[model samples]
Target: ITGDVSAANKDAIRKQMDAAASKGDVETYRKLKAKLKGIR
Candidate 1:
């Protein structure tokens, strides 16, 4: 659950998304967006 998605915690998630984006992971775009958006 996203009940604990603090800025500190999400910092790594942000970095991961950056890496994924750099790697051309468009599929991961949707997954990461859902994760960060807390809509999964």
Candidate 2:
């Protein structure tokens, strides 16, 4: 998990987060947000 997260991976997570948001999946959205934050 500490290796390398490419742009594609980041993009994918962003998309998932967006989907979660649209679906009102706060938990998933938050988790994905945290992951994106960690990557940065």
Candidate 3:
């Protein structure tokens, strides 16, 4: 919940994840998200 992650950002993230997963971008997304979440 750090930085500027608003409700709109969360919705956008859900959409991005759907598109990323559908296109086999899970690894990239997973790593990035993991690093970001770890910062907290």
Candidate 4:
């Protein structure tokens, strides 16, 4: 949660976001969402 996010890994993170969403993982999805904001 403290390291730099690589430019190309945003999609990988988004995929995890979708998986989290699909599995009712709200916090993980939220965290990943926040992490993505730093990238875009």
Give me the candidate number with maximum lDDT.
Answer: 2
For model 3, how does the per-residue alpha-carbon lDDT over 1-40 read when each residue is reduced to its tens digit? 5776656666667677667766789876776566545545
Compared with the true structure, model 1 gives a TM-score of 0.56
Model 4, stretches more than 4 Å misplaced? 1-8
- Over 4 Å off in model 2, which ranges? 1-5
- Count the clashes in each prediction: 0, 0, 0, 0
Q: Poorest 10 consecutive residues of model 3 by lDDT?
A: 31-40
Report the poorest 10 consecutive residues by lDDT, candidate 4. Answer: 1-10
TM-score of each: 0.56, 0.67, 0.49, 0.61
lDDT of 2 by residue, 1-40 (tens): 5655586787888888999977989888888888889964
Q: Model-by-model lDDT, in order?
A: 0.78, 0.82, 0.66, 0.81
* Cα lDDT, model 4, residue 8: 43
Best by TM-score: 2
lDDT of 1 by residue, 1-40 (tens): 5566676668877888888877889689669967999934
Q: Whose lDDT is higher: candidate 3's or candidate 4's?
A: 4
Error of 3 at 21 (Å): 0.6
TM-score of decoy 4: 0.61
Superior by TM-score: candidate 2 or candidate 4:
2
